[PDB]
Each structure stands twice: as C-alpha cells, then as structure tokens.
Design an enzyme around this catalytic site. Sequence first.
Site, PDB file in Angstrom:
ATOM      1  N   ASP A  35      42.146  35.990  51.297  1.00 60.56           N
ATOM      2  CA  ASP A  35      42.981  35.558  50.162  1.00 60.56           C
ATOM      3  C   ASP A  35      42.446  34.272  49.554  1.00 60.56           C
ATOM      4  OD1 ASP A  35      44.998  34.911  48.454  1.00 60.56           O
ATOM      5  OD2 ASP A  35      46.523  34.478  50.031  1.00 60.56           O
ATOM      6  N   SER A 199      38.552  31.522  31.399  1.00 58.36           N
ATOM      7  CA  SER A 199      37.935  32.632  30.709  1.00 58.36           C
ATOM      8  C   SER A 199      37.797  32.332  29.232  1.00 58.36           C
ATOM      9  CB  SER A 199      38.765  33.920  30.942  1.00 58.36           C
ATOM     10  OG  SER A 199      38.300  35.012  30.157  1.00 58.36           O
TER      11      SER A 199
END
Length: 330
Positions: A35, A199
């Site tokens: 994770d 992004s």
Amino acid sequence: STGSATTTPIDSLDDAYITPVQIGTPAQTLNLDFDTGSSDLWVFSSETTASEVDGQTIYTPSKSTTAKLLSGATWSISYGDGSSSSGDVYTDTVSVGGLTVTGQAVESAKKVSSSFTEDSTIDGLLGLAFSTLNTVSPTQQKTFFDNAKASLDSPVFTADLGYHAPGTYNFGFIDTTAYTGSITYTAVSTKQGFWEWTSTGYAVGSGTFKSTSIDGIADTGTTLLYLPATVVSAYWAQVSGAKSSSSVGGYVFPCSATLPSFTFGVGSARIVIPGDYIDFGPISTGSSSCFGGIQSSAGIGINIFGDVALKAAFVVFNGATTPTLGFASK
Ligand SMILES: Cc1nc(N)sc1-c1nccn1C
Ligand SMILES: Cc1nc(N)sc1-c1nccn1C
C-alpha cells in the site's frame, strides 16, 4: 541488494493485490496488501481477537526465534473506507522477494474492522508511503522500504500491477524489459506523507487532451481512480445511461455499455487506461447496473491515482534524497 515478488489480484475484479511476505524464523509466509498510501506493516496474528479472524493466515510471534516485543509500542490506523485495525508491535526479520530487512516493525493486530475480517485473502498490509505517516506510538517506526533503502542497489521500488493478471513489485532496480518506450519522471511532494504528484491533464476516449493540473497521490492500496467532479462528469457523460447514484455510492453505468478509455498526463507523456479497466461489474449479483472505476474525489479531500490508473503503467517510486515518481507505458 534487490528483491522481486509477484503480486496477484485477490478476485476477478482486481479489488486489491496480494504479495507473499516472509516474516520471522523459520519463515511464516503471509499475503500482504502492498500500500503506497500508508506506512504501517501490520498483520493478522495469534493476538487478533478470534471472532475477527475468518480464513486469514496469522503471524505467531512466539514461534519466531527472531521476534521481539517492542515494549510499550502500540498502533492504530484508519483507512479511507472507514476500515481500521490496531494492536501492539514486534520487531522481526521480514523478506520480500529475496530482500531481507532485520529489525522491521511488524505491527500485530489485536483488533480489525469487519471489512478486514471479511477479506479472507488479505493477511495484512505493507505500507510503502513515507515513514512520517507510520502510526506506532510512542516511537514512530520505519517502513520496509525505508529500512531496506541503504542496502538496495538503487533507492527505488517499482509497481507493475496487472489487469486481471499477476504483476510484480521490484525493490532496488528498474527492469528495463517491463515497460515500453521511456519512463517520464515527475516531481513529488512529501508534505502530506504520500507519493503526491501533479498530473498535467486528461482525455476521455478519443477526445482532445485537456491541459489542467491535477494534484493527487499514487496509491496502490486504493482500488479505484478518484478525480475531481468536473473530470469524472466529463468521463461518464460519454457513457449512455451512466449516472451518479447516491444509493449505490458513486457512478454506475449500464452493464451493456462499452466504456471509453481515459488518458492521464505525466509531464508531456500520456498513460492510457483502457475502458475495460474501468468496469467493476454488477453492483450486486445479477444486476444490470455496473459500478464505475472512475469516481469523484469530492469530499475525500485528495485525488487518488489508485489501481485503475497505476495498473495501466510501469510505476517507479524513486526514494532518492529528493523523491520522484516515474511512469511508463507497458
Ligand atoms: C480500503 C483500504 N485501503 C487500504 N489501503 S487497506 C483497505 C482495506 N480495508 C478493508 C480491506 N482492505 C483491503
Ligand atoms: C464495460 C466494458 N467496457 C469496455 N470497454 S470492456 C467492458 C466489459 N464488459 C464486460 C467485461 N468487460 C471488461
């Protein structure tokens, strides 16, 4: 040193991925959920409340000659779905894919919430975010990656998740045979303890690319792609009959649809998520309403590039002095 381990979907929807991990001496092999959105290595154990264990493999520290109670230390964690676990702590030898760390904090669950008990395939979590998020008190502990880093050939790990198929986590090296083209690296902020990046925008299907900064985290421990409401509405508007359902808890779509792809930007590069990756199947057995794999982050407080996004790429988690993230197509 290096390590390399195969990671395998837990079910036919890729709801999570498990990776075998050797703990203790002799080795006790547990299948952990790696994770990159948390920083605790915790396991089902001989200490876990018996009614809360249903099919998991447990770590039994008393059978490990290298286990030692980390006296006084406790831990307690909650995840974004409201699931949680807590307990005490041992140190022990932990190996992943041939890479060994001695003195690793192994957090033994005394209590786990229902959705852990119900997930028979997941024996615990192995956190790979920054150690500043580790929950152990009163002495915070280091992640497996931080403990291993100085020994690694290069201070990196990579995630290569499969769509409906096994994949790989590598530690200490970049497998140049595992991706196509070049790797595009992008800046990371560690201020919130995550692999947080920006992004450069998105496209829906064969549509034009929208240049827009989207801050979010690369999170292998989150199944879905969670993005701003504007972006998600633009995606689902291209699917006839798709709608956001407050009763179901997100966007649903007709199971008869053909979903469009979704592209996200990494610098000037582009990662394309095929439409198939966005299908999470019937909302309940036999339903003709299907659950979407792109959901709104509104009310989460952060955008999350979870498995839906990450499995479309070969992803480098660069733990150099100034961390960065790399993405390649594959
Ligand atoms: C929702 C979630 N996020 C994580 N990073 S572990 C977790 C989880 N809760 C219950 C089961 N599983 C896998
Ligand atoms: C819903 C969907 N959209 C695609 N582009 S393939 C796909 C689908 N239907 C059944 C299975 N799979 C993956």
